[PDB]
Symmetry: C2
Subunit: 300 residues, 2 copies
């Protein structure tokens, strides 16, 4: 038993991490088949970042201006193109370590594993959730841009996130692997507002289910509530609204734990209205929301 | 920036995870060169676990009683031996994916990454700390025994933990890779007392340094204290004592943050005596102790 924030094993993505250098700027890229994907602002100097015109800047770049290194081995760039906010570098060799993969755009509230990298070599891995305001609370120093996020289904890596920037507020922003940013953000150094970071309610409920399964039960009450009554209280406390879809998703936890979802919803209300009073659930003094119901089920 | 609980990339250990079956019992083993390491209680039935005599039980086992599978490929067992609480299975092929490795016994308070596995296939990875009472608070379902813990230094995997059991209290226990258990525990199904789980003080201080570096500063006071005066308060709150060794280790964080260790010690006193009052540090309502000062430095 036990319950841990767990990332997917990173070996399959590790074999895709390379170093991309363009001028004085080095970030990471994703080498899948014969294409390297990296943040387009690899072509930016620090002063370009204030207001870059990527098409004008990219015209000044040639294939030979792009140094791509996979470990110590140098790939020959034979094409370059801009997919929205991502550069696609055609290289001369297909990655023999290309895993089976797909590119996916995940929804707010979904979780993924990040392989944080520097100079194309993997440094660490951790599990993160896509905030409702389309930011992530990651750990990214200079040079980590282009590190990717992914989920794994059996033998397939689903790439869902590539990192591009830290907003002046300290939160992190990026794109899917076709380069469309999550949220209204762009790869330019300007003040950029992140939304109210509301709480992912469905994830909180799943974690309570995880807690009940792991024997933390003190927060169970015998109350119930309705879905609309609960959601009225949820908004005041900056929680995302709960939908029937979410109730549907929690069914297996509802069925496995013998605790009806609306009973579980009622317990959360009491935690919201009364705080935890310094008690803990699964070793945390806060309601945890970076576990999806799938995360809980997989681990359980 | 940002600060996350981060595990080491798991790819190098992933390539070592195999399935070991003995009778009706299946756990994981570590295939390094031509030796597979696994928990010796793979040879136990459920009823043996109550009071196993491993030498008498192992005499009844032959090399052919041990099925070892690396993915779909079957290894030929050509020798078996018991290193304390670990079985060493000599197999007929050296793992071509054996990374550079060493076996190390870590100290209480040190952290490591766990690659949780089932049927020899990696499931997830998370960062854990060795509790002062030589347990870990992991996430281990049935079949995860033999999953290993490790740190990485450049290209070398330091194996420090192999999982053997969950104590009736829900915490987890295991061995170094020569099979000597951490703590007074044995691989038998009996009530086994874990110690008072005291808090790893040096780790708490490092995380505060991580917090100050990441801009969480509200907990800084302008007080100082002495080392003995601080430790008097620490014991009452079930914190491990702070040594000069630990002060020495925190030097770089003290030097990087401009906050003297004893000033940082004084701040912790105030958090201990006053609680956090519902405020947060690095998004946590509790003092976090599963980051060593090295963990902080690496990430920073």
């Amino acid at each position: 038993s036990g319950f841990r924030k767990m990332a997917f094993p990173s070996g399959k993505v590790e074999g895709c991490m390379v170093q991309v250098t363009c001028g004085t700027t080095t970030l990471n890229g994703l080498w899948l088949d014969d294409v390297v994907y990296c943040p387009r602002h690899v072509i930016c100097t620090s002063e370009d970042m204030l207001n870059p015109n990527y098409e004008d800047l990219l015209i000044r770049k040639s294939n030979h201006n792009f140094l791509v290194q996979a470990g110590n081995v140098q790939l020959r760039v034979i094409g370059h193109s801009m997919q929205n906010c991502v550069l696609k570098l055609k290289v001369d060799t297909a990655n023999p370590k290309t895993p089976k993969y797909k590119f996916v755009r995940i929804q707010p509230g979904q979780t993924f594993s990040v392989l944080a990298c520097y100079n194309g070599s993997p440094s660490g891995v951790y599990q993160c959730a896509m905030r409702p305001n389309f930011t992530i609370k990651g750990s990214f120093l200079n040079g980590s841009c282009g590190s990717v996020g992914f989920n794994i289904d059996y033998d397939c890596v689903s790439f869902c996130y590539m990192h591009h920037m830290e907003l002046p507020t300290g939160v992190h922003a990026g794109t899917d692997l076709e380069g469309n940013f999550y949220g209204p953000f762009v790869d330019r150094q300007t003040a950029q507002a992140a939304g109210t970071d509301t709480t992912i309610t469905v994830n909180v409920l799943a974690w309570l289910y995880a807690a009940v399964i792991n024997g933390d039960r003190w927060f169970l009450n015998r109350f119930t509530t309705t879905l609309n009554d609960f959601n009225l209280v949820a908004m005041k406390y900056n929680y995302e609204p709960l939908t029937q879809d979410h109730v549907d998703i929690l069914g297996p936890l509802s069925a496995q734990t013998g605790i009806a979802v609306l009973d579980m919803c009622a317990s959360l209300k009491e935690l919201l209205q009364n705080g935890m009073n310094g008690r803990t659930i699964l070793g945390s003094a806060l309601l945890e929301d970076e576990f999806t119901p799938f995360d809980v089920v997989r681990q359980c």
